């Protein structure tokens, strides 16, 4: 059981750039979206996510918390505040770490949001098409009480054994302009419990202060540059944060919810009305939803036809 604990205890959430944070303005958010996957013919879609679901900021496994990142700290969010949305509103079938498992109405975008400790709403919105279609020859909406069974593919919630993984690396240097404190000609550096990489111009510079406060009595607060430089944890190699080395050594972490075979029920269209003409027949077709109708003759030249029928029609 401890394998999950170990794999999620070396990794932390991050902050990426979201171009539409729920109001049409960009921001740096803890809930930026990395990728939406849709391989299940069940209509399920699984989305990646910079925050981490199911793990406490204290690293314990809690199923009622989501841990995110603001600034340099890591706090806890109430798991009941997780919302996934499209044109309509979605149903969440499973969550673990960076991944959500939702089933949504058709839309033109996708939105996910949480509530931080201040009870503010942090959201990210991306453009996503999402026009799902069921299996078979009928475009139905809701499964019937009577029908047929056809093979389907979903995302099982085993979360245990998987072949696929994602890369992981060390975070880069994190700039922070609030670490500078100015006095009368003095430049105080208030380390908050974390090593700070350092570079000024006029006086000193180029020191990795392993948890040491300093003052500079020569330079100015506008003449320097600081950045938190500790790296004890991994994070996903997103294209919206930079990396720290060109050799670029990487880790790997198995992702949950693999693809599996399942059977999904489908309806059957009511048989049409057949009228026997001479060397031909007429069919009255009454569909409850778009339905596929085709015919062919059993000869040397088949003489076929195919069509999606959406309203009641007659075919000879």
């Amino acid at each position: 059981v401890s394998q999950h604990f170990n794999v999620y205890k070396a990794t932390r959430p991050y902050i990426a750039y979201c171009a539409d944070c729920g109001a049409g303005h960009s921001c740096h958010s803890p809930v930026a979206i990395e990728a939406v996957r849709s391989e299940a013919t069940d209509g399920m879609l699984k989305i990646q996510f910079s925050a981490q679901i199911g793990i406490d900021k204290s690293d314990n496994h809690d199923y009622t918390k989501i841990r995110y990142a603001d600034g340099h700290a890591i706090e806890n969010a109430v798991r009941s505040s997780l919302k996934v949305a499209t044109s309509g509103d979605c149903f969440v079938h499973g969550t673990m770490g960076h991944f959500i498992l939702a089933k949504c109405p058709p839309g033109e975008f996708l939105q996910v949001s949480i509530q931080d400790t201040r009870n503010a709403v942090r959201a990210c919105r991306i453009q996503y098409h999402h026009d799902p279609q069921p299996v078979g020859r009928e475009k139905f909406t809701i499964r019937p009480h009577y029908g047929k069974e056809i093979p389907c593919t979903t995302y099982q919630q085993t979360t245990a054994k998987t072949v696929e993984e994602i890369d992981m690396h060390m975070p880069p240097d994190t700039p922070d302009r609030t670490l500078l404190s100015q006095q009368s000609g003095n430049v105080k550096i208030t380390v908050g419990g974390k090593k700070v990489k350092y570079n000024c111009t006029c006086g000193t510079g180029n020191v990795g202060t392993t948890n040491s406060d300093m003052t500079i009595n020569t330079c100015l607060i506008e003449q320097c540059h600081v950045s938190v430089t500790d790296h004890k944890k991994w994070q996903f190699n997103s294209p919206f944060v930079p990396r720290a080395d060109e050799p670029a050594r990487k880790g790997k972490v198995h992702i949950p919810f693999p693809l599996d075979n399942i059977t999904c029920r489908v309806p059957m269209a009511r048989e049409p009305t057949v009228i026997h003409g001479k060397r031909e027949v007429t069919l009255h077709l009454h569909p409850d939803h778009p339905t596929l109708f085709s015919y062919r003759t059993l000869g040397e030249d088949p003489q076929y036809h195919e069509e999606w029928v959406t309203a009641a029609v007659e075919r000879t």
Partner: protein, 97 residues
């Protein structure tokens, strides 16, 4: 070719060649932010999964029923079957009987 069927190719499922012609192309980052823009023709498998056409299943002469993993055409109605038999002597009845 990009955006059409077989824009990426592979000899087998476990092969490790992976020919790819997807017209990938990088772009300069916009000033003031970290990101890696690029442009690339969308998948040709996904294009084919709409524009493929009508299957042999729908239009097959003589009422052939095109079937699963062993690709076969069940129950076509063409031709004649010559058959030759070698009956034993005990399969017949004497004229006097």
């Amino acid at each position: 070719q990009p955006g059409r069927f077989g824009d990426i190719q592979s000899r087998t499922v476990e092969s490790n060649d992976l020919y790819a012609n997807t017209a990938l192309k990088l772009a300069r980052p916009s000033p003031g932010m970290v990101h890696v823009p690029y442009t690339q023709t969308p998948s040709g498998f996904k294009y084919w999964l709409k524009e493929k056409g009508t299957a042999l299943n729908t239009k097959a002469p003589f009422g052939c029923q095109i079937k699963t993993n062993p690709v076969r055409a069940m129950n076509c109605a063409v031709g004649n079957i010559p058959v030759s038999m070698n009956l034993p002597d005990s399969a017949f009845t004497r004229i006097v009987e």
